[PDB]
């Protein structure tokens, strides 16, 4: 019964991606995924069949404490990035390596230097970042992974690898870019920012990137309708960057709630009083939201290259009523957004909120691993529903 209005002007090579970085921790936690028919199947195969043509994976330098206890949130390191990349290429999908350049979650409020770079002077940290990127990419190439793009940083609105001065951040951006350029000329270099609704922000950032000669191809943006303003604004601010600086643009992260229920007992990020919810919290609502961001980015014209849905399969390791049993799994496999072992690195946030999935209700799969009708949105935006 799913309905999808055809996206007008959508290019045939539009990037349709998903970030399923938590897939490895989940599978080790016992979680399983299925396909339409209902038979266990590799999620990457189901994604390919759904029309997805790109996979994004977050990479933390060393997301573990001194003893090796994972910080959680998927315990995403280079090693899991290779596992995911291999399965992505094996299923005909390009890879987007997303380097946070930190040992844990990197966002507007958190851009902590990796423990190894904790006390390196700026010069040495820069070359370490360049080196890390270079070696990581080479390990992926060696694994035969088809890399189509690299994100030098994740939501670096106010910092990167412990740095907050934009003159220094730019040098770090170039150190990362350098590595990518040396690895493969065909790999697109992306920079990722968020909060597009903030007046003049993206215009200021783009101009600053230009004044510091940062070498990049894609100006990426997060876009969560709950807090980031209108689609009209998104298109407007991305088009401005595109036309003024000749860059490509895209949405590196987006999602929507298909249900108000919490599937694993650990409070979800959305929905919540105060959040802007222009679509009904249903499977159709979710599908309309995705379809609309795709339209919004496509409306940018030449420069709008794609949209990545963030974590469409971070489903529960168990029902909400088995909360205590779930905690054990989140703790042991880091299949939750964070573990108590991350308190040493991030006492402020992870330190007091560690637990399970905060987005199980925004997946494109149900709590049991079955694909929701909304997964079809990737195929239907080209033609629309029959
Ligand atoms: O569980 C209900 C509560 O969740 C809190 O959110 C927690 C952290 O405060 C939040 O930073 C974290 O977000 C993770 C990561 O830091 C972020 O960059 C990324 O985009 O999402 C991650 C989670 O998917 O999530 C935890 C979850 O407990 C809310 O702050 C609190 O109000 C309440 O909703
Ligand atoms: O990780 C969650 C989420 O954070 C958003 O940014 C919030 C807030 O909305 C901003 O106004 C604030 O400046 O920074 C915080 C981060 O703590 C960000 O815009 C989203 O894309 C997500 O990263
Ligand atoms: Ca939950």
Curated annotation (Swiss-Prot):
Enzyme class, spelled out: hydrolase
GO MF term (any one): glucosidase activity
Entry binding sites for substrate: 107-110, 194-195, 228, 257, 272, 349
Enzyme Commission number: 3.2.1.-, 3.2.1.89
SUPFAM superfamilies for this protein: (Trans)glycosidases
InterPro entries assigned to the protein according to its UniProt record, in alphabetical order: Glyco_hydro_53, Glycoside_hydrolase_SF
Domain of life, source organism: Bacteria
Physiological role: Involved in galactan degradation. Degrades arabinose-free galactan to galactooligosaccharides, producing galactotetraose as the main product along with galactotriose, galactobiose, and galactose. May hydrolyze the beta-1,4-galactan linkages of the galactan portion of arabinogalactan type I, a pectic plant polysaccharide from which most of the arabinose has been removed.
Assigned protein family: Belongs to the glycosyl hydrolase 53 family.
Protein name: Endo-beta-1,4-galactanase
Organism: Bacillus licheniformis (strain ATCC 14580 / DSM 13 / JCM 2505 / CCUG 7422 / NBRC 12200 / NCIMB 9375 / NCTC 10341 / NRRL NRS-1264 / Gibson 46)
Organism ancestry: Bacteria, Bacillati, Bacillota, Bacilli, Bacillales
Gene giving rise to this polypeptide: ganB
């Amino acid at each position: 019964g799913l309905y999808v209005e055809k996206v007008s002007g959508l290019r045939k090579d539009f990037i349709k991606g998903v970030d399923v970085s938590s897939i490895i921790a989940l599978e080790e936690s016992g979680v399983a995924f299925y396909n339409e028919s209902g038979k266990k199947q590799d999620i990457f195969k189901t994604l390919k069949e759904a029309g997805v043509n790109y996979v994004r994976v977050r990479i933390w330098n060393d997301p573990y404490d001194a003893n090796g206890n994972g910080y959680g949130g998927g315990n995403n390191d280079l090693e899991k990035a290779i596992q995911i990349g291999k399965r992505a290429t094996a299923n005909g999908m390009k890879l987007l390596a997303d380097f946070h350049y930190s040992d844990f979650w990197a966002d507007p409020a958190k851009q902590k230097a990796p423990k190894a770079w904790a006390n390196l002077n700026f010069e040495d940290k820069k070359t370490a970042l360049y080196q890390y990127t270079k070696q990581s990419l080479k390990a992926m190439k060696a694994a035969g992974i088809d890399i189509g793009m690299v994100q030098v940083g994740n939501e670096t609105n106010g910092g990167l690898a412990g740095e907050t001065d934009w003159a220094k951040m730019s040098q770090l951006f170039n150190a990362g870019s350098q590595a990518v350029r040396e690895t493969d000329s065909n790999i697109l270099v992306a920079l990722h920012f968020t909060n597009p609704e903030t007046s003049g922000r993206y215009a200021w950032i783009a101009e600053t990137l230009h004044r510091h000669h940062v070498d990049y191809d894609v100006f990426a943006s997060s876009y969560y309708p709950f807090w980031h303003g209108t689609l009209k604004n998104l298109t407007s601010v991305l088009t401005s960057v595109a036309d003024t600086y000749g860059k490509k643009v895209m949405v590196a992260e987006t999602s929507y709630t298909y249900t108000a229920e919490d599937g694993d007992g650990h409070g979800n990020t959305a929905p919540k009083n105060g959040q802007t919810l222009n679509n009904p919290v249903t499977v159709q609502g979710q599908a309309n939201a995705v379809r609309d961001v795709i339209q919004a980015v496509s409306d940018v014209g030449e420069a709008g290259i794609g949209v990545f849905y963030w974590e469409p399969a971070w489903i529960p390791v168990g029902p909400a009523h088995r909360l205590e049993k779930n905690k054990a799994l989140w703790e042991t496999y880091g299949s939750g957004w964070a573990t108590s072992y991350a308190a040493e690195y991030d006492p402020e946030d992870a330190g007091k909120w560690f637990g399970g999935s905060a987005v199980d209700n925004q997946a494109l799969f149900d709590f049991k691993g079955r694909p929701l009708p909304s997964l079809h949105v990737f195929q239907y935006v080209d033609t629309g529903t029959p």
